[PDB]
Amino acid sequence: ARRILVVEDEAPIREMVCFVLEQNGFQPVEAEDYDSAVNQLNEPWPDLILLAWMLPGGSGIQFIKHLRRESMTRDIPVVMLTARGEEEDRVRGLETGADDCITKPFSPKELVARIKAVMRRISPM
Amino acid sequence: ARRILVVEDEAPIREMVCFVLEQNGFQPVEAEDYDSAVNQLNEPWPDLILLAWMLPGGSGIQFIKHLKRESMTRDIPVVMLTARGEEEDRVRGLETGADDCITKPFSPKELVARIKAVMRR
Ligand code: NA
Ligand code: NA
């Protein structure tokens, strides 16, 4: 179960992520905007979601809130994709209920290690 | 097979570039700074060089001048790696003698297409 929903509107980044994931044994799914991401919340369910802070059509925080409203999605791990610089500064220490984050640009190895760490994580408390 | 010298001090970008190129059957060679790049100018020589504008130890422009002064390296294609914002703005229209440029971030498909087009031309 290695289906990864890649919710990232920056095409070069989204495609890079898909490539890294493919080569490391995962099944990446592109979501280039908010509605595209919502339309992937069904069988077969994502095992983990990578999520940018802002998309055409909706924000990352809006998407997380959407996920939490339903039993079938509320336990899917979410890892934020954070742009180095201005965005990173604005969102540091922001509690969203997301499980982890990673800053762009990242190395292929760091992305994979962060995803694997989140996937093996025990359910809190 | 074909040797690509990746001269880039931004580690995540350098590692991404090498990852894409290696899975696509190229032989990427990493250079994280200026001296590392100069140290890779020996047999077997690179088939193409991807080059950042500024490195620890020396600039992209400096490295191009180094390449052009030697008969063995003068015809190796050079593609600049350009960052958005401040850098892209200053290097707009700089006639460096590089064969092409690519703006970061780029997709895997764009990277490979650009290098293959430069090598064919
Ligand atoms: Na975004
Ligand atoms: Na640089």
UniProtKB/Swiss-Prot annotation, chain B:
Keyword Phosphoprotein among UniProt keywords: yes
Record flagged with keyword Mitochondrion: no
First-listed, main subcellular location of the protein, grouped into a coarse class: cytoplasm
Gene Ontology biological-process entries: phosphate ion transport; regulation of DNA-templated transcription; regulation of DNA-templated transcription initiation
Recorded GO MF terms: bacterial-type RNA polymerase holo enzyme binding; identical protein binding; phosphorelay response regulator activity; transcription cis-regulatory region binding
Compartments, as annotated in UniProt: Cytoplasm
Post-translational modification: Phosphorylated by PhoR or CreC.
Domain Response regulatory per the UniProt entry, residue ranges: 3-119
Chain positions with 4-aspartylphosphate modification: 52
One cellular component (GO) term of this entry: protein-DNA complex
Record's keyword terms, sorted: Activator, Cytoplasm, DNA-binding, Phosphate transport, Phosphoprotein, Transcription, Transcription regulation, Transport, Two-component regulatory system
Function: This protein is a positive regulator for the phosphate regulon. Transcription of this operon is positively regulated by PhoB and PhoR when phosphate is limited.
Name recorded for this polypeptide: Phosphate regulon transcriptional regulatory protein PhoB
Organism: Escherichia coli (strain K12)
Lineage: Bacteria, Pseudomonadati, Pseudomonadota, Gammaproteobacteria, Enterobacterales
Parent-protein start and end of this portion: 2 to 122 of 229
